[PDB]
């Protein structure tokens, strides 16, 4: 998941917006 | 914006900044 990608790899702030309500 | 390496509490901080008053779900794997 995202928690995982951002830590094991990298992620963008735009990918994080996918988790907003 | 740039890509980020975010683990643990740092990821939660980023979600907070990105989502602000919209809120967010923090949903780690099993
Ligand atoms: Ni730290």
Describe the structure.
The complex is a heterodimer of chains A (21) and B (30). Chain A has 21 residues and is mostly helical. Helices cover 52% and strands 0% of the residues of chain A. With 30 residues, chain B is mostly helical. Chain B has one domain. Helices cover 37% and strands 0% of the residues of chain B. Chain B contains one helix and no strands. The longest helix of chain B has 11 residues. Chain B is flat. Chain B starts with 8 loop residues before the first helix and ends in an 11-residue tail after the last helix. At the A-B interface, α1 and α2 of A face α1 of B. The structure holds nickel (II) ion. Chain B: It comes from Bos taurus.
Short description:
The complex is a heterodimer of chains A (21) and B (30). Chain A has 21 residues and is mainly alpha-helical.
Give me the number of helical elements of chain A. Answer: 2
Radius of gyration of chain A from the CA trace? Answer: 8 Å
Q: Helicity range of the residues of chain A?
A: 40-55%
Radius of gyration of chain B: 10 Å
Protein name (chain A): Insulin A chain
Disulfide bonds (chain A): 6-11
Describe how the helices and strands are arranged.
The complex is a heterodimer of chains A (21) and B (30).
Chain A: H1 2-8, H2 13-16
Chain B: H1 9-19
Bound molecules: nickel (II) ion.
Protein name (chain A): Insulin A chain
Disulfide bonds (chain A): 6-11
PDB class: hormone
């Amino acid at each position: 998941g995202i928690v995982e990608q951002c830590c094991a790899s990298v992620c963008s702030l735009y990918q994080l917006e996918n988790y907003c309500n | 914006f740039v890509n980020q390496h975010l683990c643990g509490s740092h990821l939660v901080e980023a979600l907070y900044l990105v989502c602000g008053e919209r809120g967010f779900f923090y949903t780690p794997k099993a």
